[PDB]
Amino acid sequence: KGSFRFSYSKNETYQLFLSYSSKKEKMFLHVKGEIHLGRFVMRNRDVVL
Amino acid sequence: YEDKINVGGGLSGDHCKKFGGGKTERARKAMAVEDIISRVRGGSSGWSGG
Ligand SMILES: *[C@@H]1O[C@H](CO)[C@@H](O)[C@H](O)[C@H]1NC(C)=O
């Protein structure tokens, strides 16, 4: 009389997680003003110094 | 099997796999540029300019 018994059990659990994020913001607001008063025209020729 | 000589034998295997995959990607971009310029030749230095 002889009895042979054998068993086996195995589990290999893997897990992976990956994330990525990026945010950007840019602003270039500007303003300008010109308050004019008067204009003149200098004579080109026949002028005194 | 046995015959009255006995021969013994027995086997039982079990295998199992569980795989998983998931990916997610989201992008959101918004750009707005607004410029308003008004040229007025009304004839007011300071008050007309304002
Ligand atoms: C193996 O062990 C891991 C860790 O506890 C478990 O998450 C997994 O479910 C096990 N395998 C089985 C088939 O249950």
Contact at 8 Å (CB) between A33 and B50? no
Residue B5 tokens read as 């000589």
What is the rounded CA–CA span in Å between residue B42 and residue B28? 45
Residue A37, chain B, CB below 8 Å: the answer is yes
3-state secondary structure chain B: CECCCECCCCCCCCCCCCCCCCCCCCCCCCCCCCCCCCCCCCCCCCCCCC
Q: Which residue has the tokens 């080109």?
A: A44
Cβ contacts of A34 within 8 Å, gap of 6 or more: B49
CA dihedral B37, B42, B43, B46 (to 10 degrees): -50
> How long, in residues, is chain B?
50
Technique used to solve these coordinates: cryo-EM
Residue with tokens 């003149």: A40
Q: Contact A2/B7 with Cβ under 8 angstroms?
A: no
In chain A, the residue whose alpha carbon lies closest to the alpha carbon of B36 is A31
| Distance separating alpha carbons of residues A36 and B45, to the nearest angstrom | 6
A to B CB pairs, distance under 8 Å: 10
Residue B2 phi, psi (nearest 5): -140, 140
Nearest to A36 by CA among B17, B40, B4, B23: B40
- By C-alpha distance, which of A21, A24, A44, A33 is closest to B30? A24
Resolution in A: 5.6
Give the C-alpha distances (Å, rounded to integers) separating B28 from A18, A21, A22. Answer: 19, 11, 10
